[model samples]
Target: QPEPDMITIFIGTWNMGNAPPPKKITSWFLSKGQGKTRDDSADYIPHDIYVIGTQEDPLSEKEWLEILKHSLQEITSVTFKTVAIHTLWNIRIVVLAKPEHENRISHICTDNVKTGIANTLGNKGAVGVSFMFNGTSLGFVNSHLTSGSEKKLRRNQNYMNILRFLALGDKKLSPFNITHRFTHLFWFGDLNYRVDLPTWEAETIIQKIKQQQYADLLSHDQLLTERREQKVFLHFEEEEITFAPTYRFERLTRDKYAYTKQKATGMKYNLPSWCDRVLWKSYPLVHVVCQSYGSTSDIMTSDHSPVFATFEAGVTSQFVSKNGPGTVDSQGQIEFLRCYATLKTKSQTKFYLEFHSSCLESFVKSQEGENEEGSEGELVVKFGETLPKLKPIISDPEYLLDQHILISIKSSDSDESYGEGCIALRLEATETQLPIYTPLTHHGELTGHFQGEIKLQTSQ
Candidate 1:
């Protein structure tokens, strides 16, 4: 067969339970490397899109967006931008796309259904975002459903609510509801369904996980059982989970399940369950091929380990042609430079801005004649309520290609606070009336911290 017209997507879900954010999250997003060697040094394929779902997330939605943007940038050379983000109380879902594919995404919309007490609170619910990508409609639903094995009926209702309640732009549209509206649909998150096995029997099956006999345990999975009974998730497809359970772990130990104590006390315990999951459905002309699926073990901040699935999506040639090329003109090119700002109560705050002029070599050479001591332009930088400051930092054209500059501003008195802030930059020529504003290739918040030291930590 000819090379498949395909796009790769990565979907992940984690129930943070309002835990403290980890210092570094690069490992959670990075791939395991490709090729036969399959080592860290092996080259890996970059995904076209990333979908992340979180439950009981401690950080605000803005923080989560910034965190994921920073993490993806640090882990992969390819630039990924946040396309959509939706949050309902403790549940949040974010979608990021490779810059080239950004334009092909359209008709984006989101809706949420509350399933908590009285259906007013957002503590438990499903949130969905739907959009047309390359002429193919797609929907992604991130949810935290009712808990416990006995609550299977409630879980089924929650799934039904998601199907009946969510709609893209207009309800009158042909494919309006989630289940029928999209060519491909992805439903993932903490569904909170447990195995239908007794305590001893479940423990016995858990033991078999070490020997890679997961199918035996999966046969008793409540979600799968419900699907077979035609109760919920009708027509949805879930990859056979060869991995172990992703929920109910000890706080710090990270490895052992939180079952030893319950076993000792002989009290009712929340049995280990693969509550976090990713399920997909595809109609004709669309194919979703699962490449890999598993959970990350090193991240122990939450009782539930995060689960990720990789898929290769193939679409019809007609769809690809209808969407056309996803490239932008060079005139529309925008470059984003990440700046670090530090705040000190007693001393003036300092900011460090780094510039990579590799993409601007042609533009820099054309303006070489204007690079005089007094004629050169000044770089203006501004961030939230802060007045724009002009610094004569670009006098030397050669030095501008790759360099760092420090800018200082007076400090404001306040207790220690550390977060990100957006920075806009432009070059104001001494003689020109209008400044040359740089287009934003990466529109994101700059890393800022007060009093405390901030470092970008990476892992192998």
Candidate 2:
């Protein structure tokens, strides 16, 4: 097999069985089994995947297993199990293989090969095994610990128990400190830990694996948003187009079916928390994305949306920086002025004059009554009074260059649409006594939200 630097995986866990098979799971192909060519179609393509938890129906589990085996034909036979009490589907892992090492991939659960993790619910989840393309290393473990209630503490303990027994090829535990085995261990499931809240306990678990340089794929900013109170369930936020309502209340209706038969007695839909999830060990994370629950119209299947991720075993790269506007430092500002001097032209002077006049004229036209007694009237009255006093002084080239001219034109964001957006302005000294114009408030669309320092400079 070819060595891969990066690999992408698409994963989701929907309760795909309210009724029976074929009809229960809906369409699984990109375009009715045509193949994964179209971008708009929902095609099934995933790698190093895991799905676990209660199907709540017996026939659904059987149907899902059949689909799993068929969908992942790149592997040998798929396996499965169910909890004795709830009959919950425990787990399923799809293992990929290279044709040359087809004989090496083995499903073994022994003291040296694999060990059982105790669950508070009185059931030990199953682990599926796969080998590295070389056939020397093995990957194992796909677990879903019990969620909610005090059982969560026990679930963490149970998961820890499994981690303790894995012959992880660590030098500290082995007899000779000599690496004897290749164990690409991945323990992912619905860990049911709230990410918004800081947990010393959870950090310890991750720290243990980080010491071993294990990869945590969901460390990107995109996934971080999912772990917060702002998390929107795929079904509630995307489909139903509502907030805080994830699980549907029981009711049967002509419009959208309710969760219960009677509207009065039925429970109302609401999202209590982010319970459904995916967790992993040390691996290079590619991307973190998710779909809303029941994103498909097939609601009879399940309520919770499936979440998954993809990883490359060993890949690394440097972070790229985004480009931004040039800055003017103390030294750079002097050079900037020199550069501005060379760029100045007689046409630019004409442009600024026409630009400023056109802008002021538009502002006057847009007002309901430019000559009436209000803010616009007062502005006109003030400009009429100030223009004559400033005109003769501004016409002198020497006075125009004086800093005092800048002080006269300088004003805070007064009620203009593009009022505050002005960042800086350029002043031109022409022989004509035409009113000076500023590009800051010139012929540009106004957003009216800008607020910052404004600089004005002149070129003679």
Candidate 3:
């Protein structure tokens, strides 16, 4: 059987509330969209749909609708139209249609001030659109979560309200009469989450959705591991590399305008986390052909750089299922079922049993003085000579730094192929970077020794 062709939906955060006149916006779109003439290239192609927030246009509904209708003529392939959600001004959901595709849009909805959490606008208005690709149906909710010191709490509540609303569908957390078999729910926008912090509003929502077993396109495991390297995980793809500085300000006088304040201080030029995001139920995105950092050419249009992912959905099944007790050999299976029984009584016990073997190994290794050798299990440094020494480049007059150093030991034992070891010490500023050699030099051969420059910086 042939795989189904996937659609690449480009979700973006555009602060169009302060967008310039239609002609200028059109020019920007056309220029950006020129490289890829296909309708899927979001910057150029009129979208399959557009749900813009903070649209401050004051035109009458009839007049605005008429103007939007006329703009559709320029893009010959896709038809476009806007829905008004409120008076004087409105946030609009614009649908762009393809002639060959069976255009099925479901239950377009909005949130007014009373229904949504209170904010600066006194409203948390949102535009929702539903679509069906092949036989699978999905929903997309695009929004700009509230921003500003005065509106932070309210904005978060407003954001949560929209998510709960979307999850509930026509019903409210009851038996949802789901508009579609929406296995995918994608929400991406400029969520106004400053990237300096360890957690985010979107992260809170992502966890909420995941506790219910929803999958995110980007994994959180990747974030935790990268943080261990003294770095925050930055965006990446095949060809491009970036050290992004995304946010900008028009007024420098206000303390709020300081870029470093938004990002952590001293990380001024590092990437700005202006375009915050989240995704739900990403089991279908296993076939992402390409994903990348924001576009450089469209810098003037937005203060936040945009990220994009291309997805193809079909019978791609990499999902893993946990094993049951009976699946193992008889003796092992009996013990497995016993552990499983313990797990059923309390989940914490399950985790303890799950890591019991690893914990036992760690305990044995610590006591056995393991980790003394390199992979070959040969001693790389003699025990007495492996004392700690400080680098002459850095000095502290009042304190001694904690020193943790490691050595490798090769083993000749038949049972174990290799082992490693670590010896830690405390060194004062009087120490030197030069090696402290052992008096018994015949103990082990120094096979090779080399050192490269090590760079270190601290923001604290």
lDDT of each: 0.59, 0.28, 0.32
Q: Compared with the true structure, what per-residue lDDT tens digits does model 2 show for residues 1-460?
A: 4434333322333332243333333233211211122234323343333333332234544565566556445332333221111132434443333233243333332222122334234434434343332222334445544443234445545444544444433222221101112222344434443322233234443443235332231331122344233231111111111111112222221122223223542332221223334333221122222232222222333443333333334321211112111211111110011000011111111100001110011111111211213332222112221121111112222222221211112212232222211111223423332232222211111111211122222223
Better of 1 and 3 by lDDT: 1
Q: What tens digits encode model 3's per-residue C-alpha lDDT throughout 256-342? A: 212333443333331233333433333222333323323223434334333332233332211111321112111110011100100
Full candidate order by lDDT, most accurate first: 1, 3, 2
Error of 2 at 106 (Å): 6.7
Question: Which structure among the candidates has the greatest lDDT?
Answer: 1
Query: How well does candidate 3 match the true structure in TM-score terms?
Result: 0.42
lDDT of each residue in 385-432, candidate 1, tens digit only: 222222222223222211211112222333222222212222222222
Lowest summed lDDT across 10 adjacent residues in model 3 is found at 333-342
The per-prediction tally of clashing pairs is: 2, 17, 17
Stretches > 4 Å off in candidate 1: 1-4, 31-44, 116-122, 174-176, 260-268, 316-460
Candidate 3: residue 86 Cα off by (Å): 8.3
Residue 227 error, candidate 2, Å: 10
Please name the candidate that would achieve the greatest TM-score relative to the true structure. Answer: 1
Error of 2 at 394 (Å): 81
